[PDB]
Amino acid sequence: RLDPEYWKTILSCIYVFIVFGFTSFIMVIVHERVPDMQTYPPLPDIFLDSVPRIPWAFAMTEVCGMILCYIWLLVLLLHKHRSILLRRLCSLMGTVFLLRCFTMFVTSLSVPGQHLQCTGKIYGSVWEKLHRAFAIWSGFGMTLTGVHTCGDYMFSGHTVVLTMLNFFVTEYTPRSWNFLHTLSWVLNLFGIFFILAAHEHYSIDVFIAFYITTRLFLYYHTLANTRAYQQSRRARIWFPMFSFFECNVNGTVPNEYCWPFSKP
Amino acid sequence: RLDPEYWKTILSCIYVFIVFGFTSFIMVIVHERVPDMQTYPPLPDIFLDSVPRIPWAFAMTEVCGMILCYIWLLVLLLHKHRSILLRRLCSLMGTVFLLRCFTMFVTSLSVPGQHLQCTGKIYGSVWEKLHRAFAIWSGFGMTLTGVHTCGDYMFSGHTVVLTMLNFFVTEYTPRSWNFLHTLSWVLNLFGIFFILAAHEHYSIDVFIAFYITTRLFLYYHTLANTRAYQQSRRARIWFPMFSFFECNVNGTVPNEYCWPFSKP
Amino acid sequence: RLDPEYWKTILSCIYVFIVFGFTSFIMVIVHERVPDMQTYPPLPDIFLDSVPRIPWAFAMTEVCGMILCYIWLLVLLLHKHRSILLRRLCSLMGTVFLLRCFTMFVTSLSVPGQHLQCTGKIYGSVWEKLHRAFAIWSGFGMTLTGVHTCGDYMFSGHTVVLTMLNFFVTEYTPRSWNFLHTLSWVLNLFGIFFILAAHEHYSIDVFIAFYITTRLFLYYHTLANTRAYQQSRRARIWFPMFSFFECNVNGTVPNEYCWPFSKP
Amino acid sequence: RLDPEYWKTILSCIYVFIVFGFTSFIMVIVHERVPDMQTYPPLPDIFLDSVPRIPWAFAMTEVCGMILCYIWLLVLLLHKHRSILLRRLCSLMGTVFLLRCFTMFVTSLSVPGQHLQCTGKIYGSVWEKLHRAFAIWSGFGMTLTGVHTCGDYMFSGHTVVLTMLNFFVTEYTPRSWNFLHTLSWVLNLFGIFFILAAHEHYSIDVFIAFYITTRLFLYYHTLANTRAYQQSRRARIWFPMFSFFECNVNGTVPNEYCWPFSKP
Amino acid sequence: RLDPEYWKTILSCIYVFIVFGFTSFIMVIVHERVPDMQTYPPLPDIFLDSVPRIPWAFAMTEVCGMILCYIWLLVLLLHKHRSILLRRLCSLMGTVFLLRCFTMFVTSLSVPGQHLQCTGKIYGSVWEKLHRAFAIWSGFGMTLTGVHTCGDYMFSGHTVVLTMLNFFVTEYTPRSWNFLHTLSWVLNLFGIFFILAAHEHYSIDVFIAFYITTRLFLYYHTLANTRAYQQSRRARIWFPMFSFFECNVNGTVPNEYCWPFSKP
Amino acid sequence: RLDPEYWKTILSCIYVFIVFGFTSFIMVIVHERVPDMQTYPPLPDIFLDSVPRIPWAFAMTEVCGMILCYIWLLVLLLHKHRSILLRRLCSLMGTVFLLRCFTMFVTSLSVPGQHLQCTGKIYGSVWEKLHRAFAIWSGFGMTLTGVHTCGDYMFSGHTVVLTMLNFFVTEYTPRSWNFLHTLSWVLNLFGIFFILAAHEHYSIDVFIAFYITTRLFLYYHTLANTRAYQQSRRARIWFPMFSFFECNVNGTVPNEYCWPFSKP
């Protein structure tokens, strides 16, 4: 039966923080490849050529992200099996950001011309790249806490977080609340549109990020519900550290909600 | 039971040749977006920067792609249900080549500098684009029958044909011939490697083309074997013209082989 | 059984004033779009071009509302289930006014020429409008407490209030008092007629206001009497907080009468 | 049983065409009210201010209308009860277009500044109005065959036809073809979008013309399926000549399709 | 039962000469790499530095091969299952020489200093090399019919032929003639010794040639005697055309003797 | 039963270390044969001619060696039968490294031109050879602790250690951990690739050193599992001191893991 294991969530959180630090360092290394990356003319896109740049459109994506994060925290506060829920967010965020690192290492696709005045650059040493990596790490990558000074490459990260939070909010609420689901979907779509309308990413980056996050979520939940980690040697599931986390969870996690405080 | 429907196969062959003629016209519309597309420096890649250009490598991809065609043509000749096999090859080469027109329209990603001397260009009219679209159509896009004069955009097409023929040969041969299966997998991988060694496609062009054809092949044969087109209203299968072709085929197609000629 | 919920009515009451304040906030924003609002000549109307403008007709409509309010208040005073009746008035007046904001925001149609001497306007700030909205909110809209100095837009609220009160008066009275209903009906028609004769709204401003309140009033009661909110997935009700308020009420509310005080 | 009364269908077709003549004539009458109707600035809108005017947008609205009429003719030919589907169409179009005559006559609302170059005007006589109305009558109000040269009024007729032919293709096809049903929505939404983008009608005339036809279609079919016209004294149905047309039809018409011609 | 297949042996015989010709084609290509091939001093060898070069030692090895061939040919003449014995020789000599080409192609190691006066070389063409191959192929490699004029590379074929013939001589004789087997072993060891004493190959050239032929000979017979080619998925045999040739032979071939002619 | 004879393991560990001293001494003897060994041009290879020399490649070979040794020490500590796994490792390394002494002594094969700057040479005496050999003995032949300054000979020792420690991690872990098994292949393959890319050993010394250890490992464990040493007079097993070491072990050793220390 569902066993609250509080010593595995710590491991998952540590794994995700390590993954985020690795992603920041890889981003700095990749940015070190090409010096200018801001002199070319952009590729002919279908949405970046029609809709002109909206200067304030990039903060609205993070506003939507914070709203979704607050809703998800509220959901997590009033649940029975909150440990399993917190252990499933991390094991998926780490994997998707590892895929982002792999995609960004092979080929670097930026947008030629926004953030053209970003300072710093030419970080030639081993101990000066680490300070920039630390800033990007403990700045959360957001544009509000100013870290996002230069541009960003393939496999956008805001879309991943938005889609993951939307899918988790929709999944772990009772199947009778079909207005919060619509609100979350609207927030996700508006965030994606505002990522596209700020001229920060190409259309294909957003599309592949959305598809990859959705497919990985659905596949992970299908494997977890089918309970194939102990059924047989099905396919040797390639999710990093999968059977270590879901071994004690058999079947499907129900949707029981309580109040944790002992003060009515 | 398996009914040989020789008139549904003809409808499938016509469906492909319309799709192949639609893609050839899009590739001329897209080429008119940006005139130069040959002055920029290329994106920083991990394979295009290490391995230098091999001038003869792009011709060996099609040589590897004709051996797999001849081998498959022999399978299509000594089979009982060759009508269904030819109807499944066409129903998939159209769906995948339709996805190529979608991703080549939203954003156009070419390689800045090969085929820099290709003539023609500035096809400003409605009746001169069609003539250029006819040359590509009745040349199969190959570099031997000289049509491939200028560059090519996202979602490479050589990787789609190589991977589709490799999976059909493996699928429709007895599960005891695991040397022809290994030989076909070698021609697939060597053909893919020579696209990158000729500096014709980016390292991410070839990975999403390989992934999509592999994923769509396994998804088609899951539905075709589970037989979900009449089981229930599962998901309203989005494959273009799926239930029209597989309605008369129930279950799985066996692997019986014969000789069609009546002259022993 | 019919359990009077004295804590849900308080939540219901809070809902309607927030919408009342929110509507007032939108009204000042709409007035900011075009400054003049007093140069266009009246559009050709088959009703306004016949009846001359009457300065005292507008005050007569507000008089009728008070009389109808007194009749309804007396009914609420001598009813067994006075808690439920008050909860339905707030759950239906808060929905209609939500539609008023959407109609007024998408397009703005006022009366071109009346109240041309109204003062105020040109509020260039983000704090003065809040005080102006407070004046709009804490004046209840009547001209007796002069707040509505300038013109008004589409889907007038005088018709919403006059019609909504009339239906509750007729609905929650026994089917043997068919003399008060005639008095209530003539008052509603007289009040609506005075609005049109006062040149305060267009003819189509009233008709779509008369239809929407009646359609929503009857749709609310049909669902409540059928109690389909829990029977099955009837229609995926889009009424704001419908199942929450009416979960404890089953069947149809009777028309029993008593005396509220304990001193007969 | 379902007996095709061809003498009743003819009376239905002539009934709707008289309404078309009545609608065209009253359009000239309301035009004669305000002479200029091209000097005012447009009212503030939320969609007519952001999206700029597209000269060719209004042509695509009628292109989608022709396709939706071409599929409907295909459905009309192959349906066994082709004498019933046509009779219901004539009995619904006449009612909706009669409501359009009422709203145009009660009040006038147009776009002040488009189609300012249309000639003619000041048709002050008894007989010249008929000639101008006849030109509109035998032009279908289409712009491809240029008749509609001046502006248009409230309750846009392009929205009704685009929607009425969208809810008959969906309704009168088997409930397993939900791709043509999906396709006919794109033909409707894009036809709705393009008339707004061409600055032909306000953002509220389009919405209340999409709602009325959707409401007046579902209400009609609910009455017919439950045969409430003869079951009892249900509601004194207000559809003009409803019990006369649908007296020989009992129950719901099936979805049986047959080929009428005798040349297999 | 043991069915002599007179048509499979013909297919088996064709296989070995094609490999013999293919090996000869590779030999001339390897000689093209280094032009001199006769300048390096011999590497330090514990066997070559002791035994002086003997000009007539090389001719003695070819003499021993003919004597061993005569003994084997006589056995093949007076055996019941002479078809199977001849089929196995061609199926084992065509596999070892395939490994010879791979070893010789990857690296080229010859004797640095012998046959320094050999003519030919510098064949700059693509047709003259083929005519040289026929000289190599149609001379069977012996020095009696002088073809092997220059040196030879790693994995000498003299050891392969001498060792392969010896094992068949011992294997297919009854276990009571343990005097011919001793004579056969003396011829094999004497022939191998003459190769080393002739300064025609290195010491490691012979050892890895002696091991591979013996290992493959015993591995072939163990699989055939165990008849695991059809018993189960034993080891996924990588022998070229192993199951095809030995499908009709079950168990172990006996050692019955007869007379071939019909005239005793 | 499995009785850990700690007096037998010590005799195994001392036996392998004497072979290490023997191997180091004979390397000096063969080095004294040819003085120059740095003047000849390299033999024609297929991998040493395409890939240019990478100066830092040979360092990564030893880095992978330490990691494979670090994981093995982890396995050697948590295994219940840690006294058996170590004994088999010592009894296999001595046999393989004894074959290396035989092939190095019979013939000499090195890369002519690498490590041409190594000093020393001409160690002509009886006692100085021991001092030079002792330096190689207490340096593990590693280049990180620079002892191996001159060239290396046939049967590369870096291939044996990289492969022997790859087939013990795979063998002596439960048959459900096939990701560390997968990981240890990448460590082996890259260690194999880097020694070739550094121009340290020919392309045939690497292949016949990967084959011998793989063959001599599987053959040993097949003999031990079937206890053929005492079952009968099977083959007169040629492993040096085989029946002595594996006489107290019956059957196959299980995969039970336990913590030896008494501090839970």
Ligand SMILES: CCCCCC/C=C/CCCCCCCCCC(=O)O[C@@H](CO)COC(=O)CCCCCCCCCCCCCCC
């Ligand atoms: C214990 C871990 C739980 C995981 C929770 C998942 C939520 C994601 C949070 C942060 C992701 C940032 C990635 C760090 C590594 C940078 C990678 C990079 O350098 O790549 C960045 C692209 O430049 C990616 O940046 C982003 O991912 C932006 C996402 C921000 C969306 C809003 C998140 C704000 C949360 C605040 C919560 C407050 C609660 C309510 C407030 C009222």
Ligand SMILES: CCCCCC/C=C/CCCCCCCCCC(=O)O[C@@H](CO)COC(=O)CCCCCCCCCCCCCCC
């Ligand atoms: C009836 C149809 C059956 C379908 C069979 C599928 C085989 C694919 C064949 C051709 C695909 C070409 C695409 C046409 C539209 C151009 C799109 C474009 O313009 O895009 C092109 C990219 O520039 C795509 O080009 C390609 O697809 C190259 C693939 C060629 C690989 C070799 C095929 C040669 C077959 C010859 C058979 C001979 C038999 C043995 C010979 C000894």
Ligand SMILES: CCCCCC/C=C/CCCCCCCCCC(=O)O[C@@H](CO)COC(=O)CCCCCCCCCCCCCCC
């Ligand atoms: C416990 C809660 C019960 C709720 C009762 C609701 C009754 C509606 C009353 C007033 C509606 C005002 C809406 C506030 C926001 C306006 C938005 C706007 O600013 O829009 C205005 C449009 O001009 C709406 O104006 C109106 O509300 C016109 C309605 C006037 C009808 C007469 C109302 C007089 C009631 C007085 C009762 C006194 C009792 C007897 C006196 C002796």
Ligand SMILES: CCCCCC/C=C/CCCCCCCCCC(=O)O[C@@H](CO)COC(=O)CCCCCCCCCCCCCCC
């Ligand atoms: C055979 C039965 C088919 C049923 C189709 C019925 C649809 C009615 C069409 C047009 C009504 C026009 C009314 C005239 C006066 C309107 C007053 C006005 O002036 O109002 C106009 C706008 O204010 C109304 O304009 C329109 O009606 C726009 C609708 C155009 C959409 C395509 C209509 C083409 C119908 C042709 C039928 C032939 C079939 C060939 C198939 C390709």
Ligand SMILES: CCCCCC/C=C/CCCCCCCCCC(=O)O[C@@H](CO)COC(=O)CCCCCCCCCCCCCCC
């Ligand atoms: C169909 C089966 C018949 C049985 C006979 C099998 C004996 C094989 C003979 C020769 C194999 C030569 C391989 C051809 C391609 C060489 C590749 C290369 O080009 O490589 C050569 C490198 O030197 C290999 O040369 C050799 O084959 C040396 C082997 C010589 C051993 C003596 C062979 C003499 C046989 C004469 C038989 C005559 C019968 C009695 C005479 C009175």
Ligand SMILES: CCCCCC/C=C/CCCCCCCCCC(=O)O[C@@H](CO)COC(=O)CCCCCCCCCCCCCCC
């Ligand atoms: C109980 C744990 C077992 C560990 C297995 C160690 C295997 C021996 C490694 C190397 C043997 C070197 C022999 C010296 C003379 C070779 C002749 C020559 O000079 O030949 C050299 C090349 O020709 C051989 O070089 C090598 O041996 C390459 C192997 C390097 C890979 C890393 C090995 C280092 C592991 C040390 C960790 C030990 C931890 C404490 C121990 C208690």
